[PDB]
Amino acid sequence: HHHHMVDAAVAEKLEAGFQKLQEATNCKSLLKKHLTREIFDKIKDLKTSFGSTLLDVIQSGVENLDSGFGVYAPDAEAYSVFNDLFEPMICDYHTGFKPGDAHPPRDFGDLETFGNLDPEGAFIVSTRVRCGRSLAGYAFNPCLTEANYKEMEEKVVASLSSLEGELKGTYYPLTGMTKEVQTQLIQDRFLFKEGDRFLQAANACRYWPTGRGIYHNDAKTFLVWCNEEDALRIISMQKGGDLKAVYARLVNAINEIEKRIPFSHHDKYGFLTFCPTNLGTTIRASVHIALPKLAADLAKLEEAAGKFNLQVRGTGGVYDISNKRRMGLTEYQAVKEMYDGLQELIRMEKEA
C-alpha cells in the first residue's frame, strides 16, 4: 500500500472521532491529551504499507472514551508512520524514556548474579515476571488474515510442543475448547476469552477463536497465551520469593522460542507490541510481599522503593511491588531493579 491517501469514509470517521474526543471535555485518556489538532492535521492522510490508517490506531480510544491510553499499533510500521502521535504518548506513559533515546539491544544478563531473596519465606508471597512478543513477518491483530492466525499458531505450537524438562507441558486451543477445560483453566487463572470492549473496538478479535490458545507447564509455573493482545504473552510465576528461578525459567523459554521464531523489533522502541504500554523489554515483574512493620509509614515505603524505580500498591500490610521502567534499560537492569529494591525493603522491614 502507498504511504499517502486514505479514502473518504476513513477521512470522515477520523474527523468525527477527533470531534468526539474534543466534545468529551472531561476525557482523561493519553489519546485525548496528545492528539492535538495540529498533530491530527499532519498525519490524518498517511498509511502504512499494510494499509493501516490513523483510524486503525485511534478507533478504540474514540469508541471507549474512558480508555487510559487509547491507541494500539495495527502493524509494526504504524510506530513510524504515526510516530508524531505514538512518540509523545509512549514517552509520557513510560518512565525514563525521552524522544531521541534508543532502547538497548536485548540482554537478559548473568543469572548467577542473582542471590536468594527470601529463602525462609518470611516476606514474599509470590513472584511473577511477564513478557510479550510479536512475531516478525506479520502485521498485528487489526490486519491479520484468517490464514495468518492459523500459520502463526502452527509456528508457536511447534516451538512450545518441543519444550523439554522444566518447561514441558500441554497446549490447549481455544478452538473447540471444552467446558471441562474452560473450568480447569479458570481455576488456575489461566483462561482468556474474547477481548473486552477495548480490544473489540481495536479490531483485535477478528476470526475468533482461530489461532488462539493457552500453554502451561505441568508444574503451573510457566504460562503462554497465543494470539491474545500479542502473538505471545509469556509468564513465569511461583509461590515464594525465588526471583532467580522465576527469571531463569523465563529466559530459557524465550531463548528457546527465538531459536525458531524471530520477534518484531524496532531500533528505538525495542520489542514491538500491540499496546504501546508493553514496549522495550516488555517486562512486567510483580512480587506480592508482606511488610507489616513498614506498613506503618507508606510514604517512606514508597520513597525507598522509588530509589530503585519500583512502584508500591497495597493489595493488611501486603503490597504488590513492580518495575516502573520497561523502556530505556536492559532486561537485566529491570529485573535487577526489582531484586535490589526488594532487598532494601526487606532489610528495612527487618530493621524496623
Numbering used by the authors: -3 to 311, 320 to 356
Task: Reproduce, without paraphrasing, sentences from the article in which this PDB structure was first reported.
Arginine kinase (AK) plays a crucial role in the survival of Daphnia magna, a water flea and a common planktonic invertebrate sensitive to water pollution, owing to the production of bioenergy. AK belongs to the phosphagen kinase family and acts as an energy modulator when bioenergy is required in invertebrate cells, by reversibly converting phosphoarginine and ADP to L-arginine and ATP. In structural aspects, both AKapo and AKholo have been shown to consist of two domains, an arginine interacting in the N-terminal domain and ATP in the C-terminal domain.
Moreover, the disruption of the hydrogen bond decreased the stability of the secondary structure of DmAK H227A. The highly conserved H227 residue adjacent to the arginine binding site affected the structural stability of DmAK, and the turnover (Kcat) value of H227A decreased by about 17.9% compared to the wild type as shown by the enzyme kinetic results.
